[PDB]
Amino acid sequence: MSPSSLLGLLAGLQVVYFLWTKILTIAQNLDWWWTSLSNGFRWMYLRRFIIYLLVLLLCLIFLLVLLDWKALGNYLWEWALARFSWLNLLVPLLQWLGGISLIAWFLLIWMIWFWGPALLSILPPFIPIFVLFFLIWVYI
Amino acid sequence: MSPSSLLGLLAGLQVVYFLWTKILTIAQNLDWWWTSLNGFRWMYLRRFIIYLLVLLLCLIFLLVLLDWALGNYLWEWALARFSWLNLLVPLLQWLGGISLIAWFLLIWMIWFWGPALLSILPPFIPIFVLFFLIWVYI
DSSP: OHHHHHHHHHHHHHHHHHHHHHHHHHHHHHHHHHHHHOOHHHHHHHHHHHHHHHHHHHHHHHHHHHHHHOOHHHHHHHHHHHHHHHHHHHHHHHHHHHHSHHHHHHHHHHHHHHHHHHHHHHHHHHHHHHHHHHHHHHHO | OOHHHHHHHHHHHHHHHHHHHHHHHHHHHHHHHHHHOOTHHHHHHHHHHHHHHHHHHHHHHHHHHHHOOHHHHHHHHHHTTOSSHHHHHHHHHHHHTSOHHHHHHHHHHHHHHHHHHHHHHHHHHHHHHHHHHHHHHO
């Protein structure tokens, strides 16, 4: 048997472990990089494997999201029967998120970016302001 | 609106607090996750990634509610890709038959041994592969 079967199987395996060690080395760096921003080795593999699962899921999801845009709104309209008071507040926002949309993409994303550090710093005083806003929403 | 509904709302106020702190707990879990397996600048971004994972996770859980139909619907469209996979699902079903408890047995032993085996595995692969190849050389 061996000459055909071995030749075909070894060629396929050879590529696969080369890609797998490439995939591992992609992940090895990636995983480091994320933590770098800041049973353990079995966890380091398992964490990566979980990351590969997230990547797998994200590939499927990324494809699914592309392919609807290429059904979400209609499923969101079933949720709109539950949501409808909060969805009436979303209807004006969907007038800004379409309306100002091109302008807001450039302008707002930069303005808010340094506002992102401002949000982190403001968040703690904003929690009492959000409680005040909630008391106003209960009042009127 | 009754005082008993207010006592339930107060448990909801610990749910608010529990939600905020739940974000930070995820980070804490991860921190040993890495260490087993200025700081705003990194910490902040890392909690955003947690947010994205939480959202994603919720979307995945919601897809499981749509399912438990969705699985079959996609799995049918995937047949458009399946060459081997049609034959391979039954093969995985050979272990599938070793089902209710015995899947869990397989998983549990695979973890429990698995680290030791994974060290052993490159040492073991030469003799292991040699043995199967010898059974084909026979």
